[PDB]
Amino acid sequence: EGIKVFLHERELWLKFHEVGTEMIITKAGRRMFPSYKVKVTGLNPKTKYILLMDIVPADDHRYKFADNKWSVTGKAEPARLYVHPDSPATGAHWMRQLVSFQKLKLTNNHLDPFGHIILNSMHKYQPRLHIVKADENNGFGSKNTAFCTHVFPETAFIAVTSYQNHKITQLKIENN
Ligand SMILES: [Mg+2]
Ligand SMILES: [Mg+2]
Ligand SMILES: [Mg+2]
Ligand SMILES: [Mg+2]
């Protein structure tokens, strides 16, 4: 309750979103662009929190880009978490500056040893931020605790191994 989350660079995300966001995935792992960063308010300055992200299927389809349009061409193929390095930390710490997840990497390697987030190319995905609160003793592990989940629709994207839409390729270059 009363915890709020604000997406950093929301305008840039929207630029990509309007066109149809694509994120490159590679065997070794590739960072997202834009970077996913958030501002958080309403945390108890004293209580400890764990922040983490996951990236879940946005739907159960597989896609193809053709004639300047994304289309569903079939069912999604048969199907990890990123814990923020600072976790756990006081609400005061989390609120002091932006919470950046820019180190998060995407891979297409189903046998990835690095613990990167594994995605399937030509599938649509939705990043989610989770905030997990410590227990009554301000510790973790001894009880299942309360947590909240924040979903920014404008951060959804299709995973690709190379850019499909020319507008995306142009946006990536102009901004990164
Ligand atoms: Mg799309
Ligand atoms: Mg590769
Ligand atoms: Mg990279
Ligand atoms: Mg289908």
From Swiss-Prot:
Record feature DNA-binding region, as residue ranges: 7-176
Localization of this protein: Nucleus; Cytoplasm
Top-level division of the source organism's lineage: Eukaryota
Functional summary from the UniProt entry: DNA-binding protein that regulates the transcription of several genes and is involved in heart development and limb pattern formation. Binds to the core DNA motif of NPPA promoter.
Complex formation: Monomer. Homodimer (via the T-box); binds DNA as homodimer. Interacts (via the T-box) with NKX2-5 (via the homeobox); this complex binds DNA. Interacts with GATA4. Interacts with KAT2A and KAT2B.
Noted disease: Holt-Oram syndrome: Developmental disorder affecting the heart and upper limbs. It is characterized by thumb anomaly and atrial septal defects.
Domain comment, as recorded: The T-Box domain binds to double-stranded DNA.
The protein's name: T-box transcription factor TBX5
Species annotation: Homo sapiens
Gene name as annotated: TBX5
Residues of the full protein shown: 52 to 230 of 518
